[PDB]
Design a protein around this ligand. Structure first.
Ligand SMILES: [Ca+2]
Ligand SMILES: [Ca+2]
Ligand SMILES: [Ca+2]
Ligand SMILES: [Ca+2]
Ligand SMILES: [Zn+2]
Length: 316
């Protein structure tokens, strides 16, 4: 809407206070004009019609329980925008400052979040499996990264290309989590998953097998569930990315870590310059090797470490 940029204050899903960029025109709307062509957050009102209503608030204070998922969707979308702009010189998901839209309170007891081709969408969870999913910065950045992928590599959401698609979202979701530097880790969704169980998460990049996901190509899932295992075989690529960044020895294969920033540079370049809609795991390895070669040279430790990491997960 047309109005003047304002700064509200609220509490997120985990009870943390934060300022949010709003817009004033009769009401205070969750519309952040300070980033690109805007970040807009909507109320889906427990229904499934999208996007719903642009979030309006009478007093610019967002401390009600019902406000918390909106506060976090809005704020963490801003953090993710900042990461792509400041770290990769990328202006929003299309590279041309496209408006970023999110809807919260999607459906009733909805244990998921997603990018629908046009916007991010967050369930509230059923209170047992999940609390409102926008409470997880890695979750928010995972979903917005699907938009980046849609506009760049375009990895088809099935089989190996879809597992790369998922891994790309987990990798950058985690790198955004580290960029915000609150409580960062190599796990996915720990802040919103199972409020009654401490120490777990949806997936682990450091040890995908902890949650039943493969950590080696020989253990890949080949059935039809989950679009051919896109959230399962992502563990093979997640483990390789973890190894590139942090190093380690895995199935007897030693990898020299090069750190999170170089991992992000290599995979961002692969995503935007080399990967295609049909790329498989072997093609991702080639794309990552070529990206590391572009950035650091063919004789570099970075190229050597990328090869070691894909070797360790059985991807040639
Ligand atoms: Ca209020
Ligand atoms: Ca964390
Ligand atoms: Ca995490
Ligand atoms: Ca938990
Ligand atoms: Zn995803």
């Amino acid at each position: 809407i047309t109005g003047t940029s304002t700064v509200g204050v609220g509490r997120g899903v985990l009870g943390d206070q934060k300022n949010i960029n709003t817009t004033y025109s009769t009401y205070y709307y969750l519309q952040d004009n300070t980033r690109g062509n805007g970040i807009f957050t909507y109320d889906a009102k427990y229904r499934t019609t999208l996007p719903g209503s642009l979030w309006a608030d009478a007093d610019n204070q967002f401390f009600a329980s019902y406000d918390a998922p909106a506060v976090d969707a809005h704020y963490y979308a801003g953090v993710t925008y900042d990461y792509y702009k400041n770290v990769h010189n990328r202006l929003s998901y299309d590279g041309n400052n496209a408006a970023i839209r999110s809807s919260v309170h999607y459906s009733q007891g909805y244990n998921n979040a997603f990018w629908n081709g046009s916007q991010m969408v967050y369930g509230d969870g059923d209170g047992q499996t999940f609390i409102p999913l926008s409470g997880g910065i890695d979750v928010v950045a995972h979903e917005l990264t699907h938009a980046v992928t849609d506009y760049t590599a375009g990895l088809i959401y099935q089989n190996e290309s879809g597992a790369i698609n998922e891994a790309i979202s987990d990798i950058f979701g985690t790198l955004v989590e580290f960029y915000a530097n609150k409580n960062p880790d190599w796990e996915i969704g720990e802040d919103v998953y199972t409020p009654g169980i401490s120490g777990d998460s949806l997936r682990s990049m450091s040890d995908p097998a902890k949650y039943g996901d493969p950590d080696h190509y020989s253990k890949r899932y080949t059935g039809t569930q989950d679009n051919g295992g896109v959230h399962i075989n992502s563990g093979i690529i997640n483990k390789a990315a973890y190894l590139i960044s942090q190093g380690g020895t895995h199935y007897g294969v030693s990898v020299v870590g090069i750190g999170r920033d170089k991992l992000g540079k290599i995979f961002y370049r692969a995503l935007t310059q080399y990967l295609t809609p049909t790329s498989n795991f072997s093609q991702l390895r080639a794309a990552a090797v070529q990206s590391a070669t572009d950035l650091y040279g063919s004789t570099s430790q970075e190229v050597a470490s990328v090869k070691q990491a894909f070797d360790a997960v059985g991807v040639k």
